[PDB]
Amino acid sequence: SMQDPIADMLTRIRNGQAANKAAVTMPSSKLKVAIANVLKEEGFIEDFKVEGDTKPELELTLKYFQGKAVVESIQRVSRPGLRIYKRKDELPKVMAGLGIAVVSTSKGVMTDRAARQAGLGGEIICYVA
Amino acid sequence: SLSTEATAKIVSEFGRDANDTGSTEVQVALLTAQINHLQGHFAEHKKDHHSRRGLLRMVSQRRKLLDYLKRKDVARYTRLIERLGLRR
RNA sequence: GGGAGAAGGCACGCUGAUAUGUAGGUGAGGUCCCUCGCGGAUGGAGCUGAAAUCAGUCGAAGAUACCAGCUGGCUGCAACU
RNA sequence: GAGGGCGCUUACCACUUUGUGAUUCAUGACUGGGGUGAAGUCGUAACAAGGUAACCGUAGGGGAACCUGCGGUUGGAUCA
RNA sequence: GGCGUAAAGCGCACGCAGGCGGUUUGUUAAGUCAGAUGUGAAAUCCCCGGGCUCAACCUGGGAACUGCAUCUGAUACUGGCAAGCUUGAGUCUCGUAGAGGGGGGUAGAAUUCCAGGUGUAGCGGUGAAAUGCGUAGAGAUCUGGAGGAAUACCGGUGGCGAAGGCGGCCCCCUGGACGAAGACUGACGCUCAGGUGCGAAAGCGUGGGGAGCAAACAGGAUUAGAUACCCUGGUAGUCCACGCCGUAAACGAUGUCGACUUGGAGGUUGUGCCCUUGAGGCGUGGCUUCCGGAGCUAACGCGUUAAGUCGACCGCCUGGGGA
RNA sequence: UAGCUAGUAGGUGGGGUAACGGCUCACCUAGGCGACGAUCCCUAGCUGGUCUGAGAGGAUGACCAGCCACACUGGAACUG
Ligand SMILES: [Mg+2]
Ligand SMILES: [Mg+2]
Ligand SMILES: [Mg+2]
Ligand SMILES: [Mg+2]
Ligand SMILES: [Mg+2]
Ligand SMILES: [Mg+2]
Ligand SMILES: [Mg+2]
Ligand SMILES: [Mg+2]
Ligand SMILES: [Mg+2]
Ligand SMILES: [Mg+2]
Ligand SMILES: [Mg+2]
Ligand SMILES: [Mg+2]
Ligand SMILES: [Mg+2]
Ligand SMILES: [Mg+2]
Ligand SMILES: [Mg+2]
Ligand SMILES: [Mg+2]
Ligand SMILES: [Mg+2]
Ligand SMILES: [Mg+2]
Ligand SMILES: [Mg+2]
C-alpha cells in the first residue's frame, strides 16, 4: 500500500525526470511541503504549488538544463522499515559535498549544510545530486 | 445472496436511521445473517468448498469489524455481541 | 486399549498427644412452620469412627499365623475366549 | 548446684551399592545403497524428430538402462 | 549479493502472533537530536614530545575510548493519547457477463452386449502378418432391448476460479467478479513464521458400478535378442458415495499488496454521449492477446498484465556429485 | 532438544544470617519460567585488548594488567 509517501514523492520525481515530463503532481502533506521548499532553495526545482483544499494536490515544476535533467540521482534513505538517525558529527555529505542530503532536525527539515551550521542531528530522509 | 427486504430490515434495526448503511454494527449484522443462513446451506452440499471460501471471508471480515469496533468504542461492541449471541 | 502387578523400591506393629474419639457419619430434647403426620427448617446431645502427621516403645524378626504372585531375555507355533 | 566436656541418640551428607532408563564413542558375522579406478560383459535409455518427442508426479511390470498405464508442462523437431 | 531460464517464489489460499502503515489540529516527549555531570583502570593504539649514539625500547602531557546512567532542554520526524478527515477499505441501491461451486432432474448422438429377421463365406487386423472371430452361419443390414460413460456443432491467444481445475439442457441453493450514479462507516488497511483450510492424476479403505479405454497378465509378430514399440484379448483402475493420501514441468518455471513511467494493432465484457440519420461512431471503466519504446538484463528476453522506477511483509539460495 | 517446574514460585509467621531473600522450617495461595529459545545436549574460564581488516566485521583472550575459579579426587568443619 502507500505506507511510504516519501519514496512516492521521490519516485514520481525520479521517473518524471527520466521521462522528460515538464511537471509532476501528487497528494500533498506538510512534510512533503517542507521538502519541495528545500529543493527549490538548493536550485533543484523551479517552483511548487499545493493547489487543492480538502484533498490537497501538491505540484512540483521540474527543471532541465542541457539535454540533462537537473536531478541526477535522488534516493530514499531512512525508511519505515529501517529508520536512520545521525547526530551532527556523523551527518553524511552527498557527492563529496556536491549535491545535498535532506535531514529532519529538532527544529525541522533542512539540508545537512544548514543543520551543520546549527549543530544538530536528526532523521536523514534522502540524498540528492 | 441476501434479499432486499432482509437487508433493508437490518439497516433500519441497527443504524442511525435508515441510510446508515455502512455503520460497523450494520455490517456485522448483515454478515451474521448470511453466515447463519448459510449454516443451513452448508449442512447440505458441504462439498461446496468454493462457496465456503466465500463464507470464511465473511467470518474473518466480521471479526475485523468487531475488533475495530471493540477498540474505538467498547459499549457498542459489548452490546453488539450480546444482541447477536456470539463469543463464549 | 495394551505390554503392566512389567521390572525394582520406601512404608507396616505398639502407645500418648494434635482431638480425654478430629473429619466424617448417625442424629435426641430444645425450638418454629404444620395445608398437623409414618409430615418439616432449626438443631448437633449421645452413638459410632478410618487414615494421616509429631513423639515415644519394643524383639532377631510387626503384610509376624493361616492365607497369599517367582520375576527377566532370544525364539518356533497358533490371532484371540 | 549451675555449667562444661564426654559418650550415646536423631538429622543432614561424601566414599560405595542394587534394579532400571536415556545419550555418546568403538566394534560386529552378514548385509543396502554410495564413490573411484583398470577402460572388462551385456546391451544402447537420453542428446538430432536420438530413430516409440522429452520430462514431472504416480502405479504397476521387467537381467539392466528401461517398457507401460493415467494426468500435467514445452524446456518437443516437422507444420501450403 | 541474489532467486523467468545459472543455486534459489512454498501448488494456492485464509489468517493469530509478529513487522509495516494515508491525511489535519492538539498534547506528550518514549525512540530522536542538542548541552552537561559521572562513568568507561592503567598499559595498548594514535598525536605532539623527551629520553638511551639510531632504532626496537622507555617514557611525558593531549587525543581517543564512539558505550552507559542521570540531569536541564529541542519537537521536525517516528511513536503513545484525544478530536477529527475522505482520497485507501468496507456496506447499501439498480443492473451486466460467465464450463465458479453443491444437489436433483432430463435430452439426444455413439460404442458394447442379449433376443429376432434377411443373407453367404469370410471378417478383422498389419509395413506384411499371424493370433483371434466365422458354415454351431460371422461380418454386413434391419428390429426390439439392456447398461455405463462422455456430452459432437457452437467453441474462439473466448470466459470463470485463489490455485488445483471447471464445457449437452433445465431447475434448486450458493461464492466471487465488473459498471453506473448516489448515500453510508470513517484508516476498519498491507503482509504472514506458527496454525488452518483447499489441493490434477495415480494410489489406498468400505460398499456400489463396469459400456468404452487400459497398468498387470496372456497370446500373435518384429528382432541378433525383444520382458518392448505393433497386433488379438484382458484385471485393477478410470465412474458414484463416504474417508484417506497431500504430491506434479502444482509453470508464466515470475509470492503477495500499493505508486509511477512513451506507444501500436486486436479479442472480451460493462457503460455515458451520438442524428442506431442503417451494420456504425466517437468517449469512460474491467479482464485479456500480440508486437514493441526508454530502462533493465549475462544473453535469450521483459517491456504500464515489467524482468522498468521506488515502497512494506513473507518464502527461499550459498560449487558438483553423494542426497 | 519444545516444554522445563513441588521448596518448585508467592504468602503469614519461627529460626537463621555480619546482612535481604525459600537462606531454612512448618502453615496457607497455585503459581513461576519459555518461542524475546525455557530446559536438554555439546563446548568454553571473562574483560582491558590481541591478529587481520580502508572500514564494518571476522578470528581470538600465552607473555602484560583487572575479576573468578582451583590447591592428589570427592565430602566437611575449624581458627581468625
Ligand atoms: Mg450471484
Ligand atoms: Mg490356540
Ligand atoms: Mg534410443
Ligand atoms: Mg526416443
Ligand atoms: Mg503419456
Ligand atoms: Mg551470486
Ligand atoms: Mg534448473
Ligand atoms: Mg507460484
Ligand atoms: Mg586508558
Ligand atoms: Mg630522540
Ligand atoms: Mg504525532
Ligand atoms: Mg477404489
Ligand atoms: Mg495393448
Ligand atoms: Mg515440491
Ligand atoms: Mg515484446
Ligand atoms: Mg520471614
Ligand atoms: Mg574447561
Ligand atoms: Mg574487504
Ligand atoms: Mg577439598
Side-chain angles (χ1 to χ4, degrees):
Chain A
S1 315
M2 328 66 173
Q3 300 154 39
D4 190 352
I6 305 304
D8 182 50
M9 206 225 287
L10 301 201
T11 294
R12 278 161 120 98
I13 296 178
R14 191 193 306 119
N15 290 312
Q17 282 271 237
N20 283 76
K21 281 289 298 273
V24 119
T25 145
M26 65 212 68
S28 176
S29 75
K30 301 320 285 196
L31 186 43
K32 283 183 191 152
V33 163
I35 296 169
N37 242 116
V38 170
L39 294 167
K40 165 170 106 170
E41 285 319 290
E42 302 296 314
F44 280 155
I45 45 168
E46 278 236 341
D47 188 278
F48 64 99
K49 235 174 164 106
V50 40
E51 181 177 347
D53 320 84
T54 68
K55 288 154 61 159
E57 194 79 294
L58 168 316
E59 175 228 323
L60 308 157
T61 304
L62 288 171
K63 261 171 83 200
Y64 297 80
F65 197 58
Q66 255 90 83
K68 312 176 42 66
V70 166
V71 182
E72 214 174 75
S73 67
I74 172 34
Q75 296 306 142
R76 228 259 122 106
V77 178
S78 170
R79 11 179 281 257
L82 170 249
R83 298 284 170 185
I84 302 299
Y85 306 101
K86 283 42 241 313
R87 300 201 276 272
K88 77 181 194 182
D89 333 69
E90 309 148 279
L91 285 215
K93 9 175 67 198
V94 179
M95 285 210 32
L98 302 203
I100 65 102
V102 186
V103 43
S104 178
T105 60
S106 340
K107 262 160 165 44
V109 192
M110 25 148 71
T111 171
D112 64 323
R113 199 232 262 93
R116 200 126 39 189
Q117 283 172 13
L120 29 65
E123 180 187 332
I124 94 177
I125 283 57
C126 58
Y127 302 154
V128 200
Chain B
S1 200
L2 233 43
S3 52
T4 304
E5 208 238 34
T7 96
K9 247 189 73 167
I10 296 180
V11 169
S12 319
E13 296 182 338
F14 297 77
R16 296 45 105 179
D17 95 53
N19 303 76
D20 185 12
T21 198
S23 96
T24 301
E25 295 129 329
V26 176
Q27 288 189 65
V28 158
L30 286 126
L31 292 177
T32 296
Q34 241 301 326
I35 292 176
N36 297 356
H37 178 4
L38 249 31
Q39 201 53 52
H41 166 70
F42 292 100
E44 186 191 13
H45 305 291
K46 189 155 39 183
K47 288 307 196 290
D48 186 9
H49 295 295
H50 290 63
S51 299
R52 216 187 273 278
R53 178 173 112 108
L55 166 57
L56 313 169
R57 187 159 163 294
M58 318 183 176
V59 161
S60 53
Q61 183 176 340
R62 180 179 61 171
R63 231 305 166 143
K64 307 185 207 204
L65 285 313
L66 279 80
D67 288 341
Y68 165 80
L69 210 193
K70 179 166 220 148
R71 40 202 211 66
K72 284 249 78 165
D73 195 313
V74 187
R76 281 229 313 293
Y77 165 88
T78 307
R79 285 229 319 162
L80 176 56
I81 61 171
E82 181 139 323
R83 183 149 142 235
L84 287 26
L86 40 217
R87 201 83 65 274
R88 314 125 302 197

